[PDB]
Amino acid sequence: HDNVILELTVRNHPGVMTHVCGLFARRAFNVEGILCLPIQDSDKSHIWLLVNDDQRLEQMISQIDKLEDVVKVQRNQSDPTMFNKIAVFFQ
Amino acid sequence: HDNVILELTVRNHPGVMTHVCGLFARRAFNVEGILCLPIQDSDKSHIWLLVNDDQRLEQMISQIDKLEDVVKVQRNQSDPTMFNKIAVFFQ
Ligand SMILES: CC[C@H](C)[C@H](N)C(=O)O
Ligand SMILES: CC[C@H](C)[C@H](N)C(=O)O
Numbered sequence: 222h223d224n225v226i227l228e229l230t231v232r233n234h235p236g237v238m239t240h241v242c243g244l245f246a247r248r249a250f251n252v253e254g255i256l257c258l259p260i261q262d263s264d265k266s267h268i269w270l271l272v273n274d275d276q277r278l279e280q281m282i283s284q285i286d287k288l289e290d291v292v293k294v295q296r297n298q299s300d301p302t303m304f305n306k307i308a309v310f311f312q
Numbered sequence: 313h314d315n316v317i318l319e320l321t322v323r324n325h326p327g328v329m330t331h332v333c334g335l336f337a338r339r340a341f342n343v344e345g346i347l348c349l350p351i352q353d354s355d356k357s358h359i360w361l362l363v364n365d366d367q368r369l370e371q372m373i374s375q376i377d378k379l380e381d382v383v384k385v386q387r388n389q390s391d392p393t394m395f396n397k398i399a400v401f402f403q
């Protein structure tokens with residue numbers, strides 16, 4: 222469909238979410254949904270980003286990958302409707 | 313307990329999440345959990361931020377309030393365990 226889920230594994234450090242989102246912001250690229258959770262007994266966190274499927278997305282995944290504190294960035298290996306399901310409980 | 317939920321209503325525009333998180337980042341203030349959802353049939357979105365209960369938080373709520381595209385910022389008027397509940401389904 223229209224959107225894509227990007228799943229990031231990042232270091233749970235101050236400022237990594239600003240850097241990740243700044244890459245999108247610097248291009249006026251909107252982010253539709255965000256879920257961020259720490260990983261249990263770990264120094265990392267998971268970031269799920271709901272974004273529109275885009276030609277520019279492949280280049281931006283590359284920028285995200287080179288970021289500081291980002292260890293892995295995945296496209297479309299998560300739950301495609303995960304934000305619809307969360308939305309049933311939070312509005 | 314240790315943490316606090318900040319609930320923001322913001323314009324669903326590119327770059328607002330970068331600005332919101334940059335205020336925390338500029339102070340090395342960590343953000344523990346994030347949920348961001350668009351509001352149905354609307355031009356806004358909701359941002360829930362899980363942060364440590366802090367003396368500096370009252371000043372930073374003030375900075376967040378003066379931000380561009382932020383219409384409302386609330387402290388502790390949401391679900392205190394909301395990220396624990398999401399965590400049962402997403403890790
Ligand atoms: C958290 C997403 C916010 C509302 C906006 N869409 C942005 O790209 O910054
Ligand atoms: C999304 C939160 C990330 C992992 C980090 N805690 C930060 O403050 O930017």
Ligand SMILES: [Co+2]
Pocket residue numbers: 232234290
């Ligand atoms: Co670091």
Ligand SMILES: [Co+2]
Pocket residue numbers: 323325381
């Ligand atoms: Co705007």
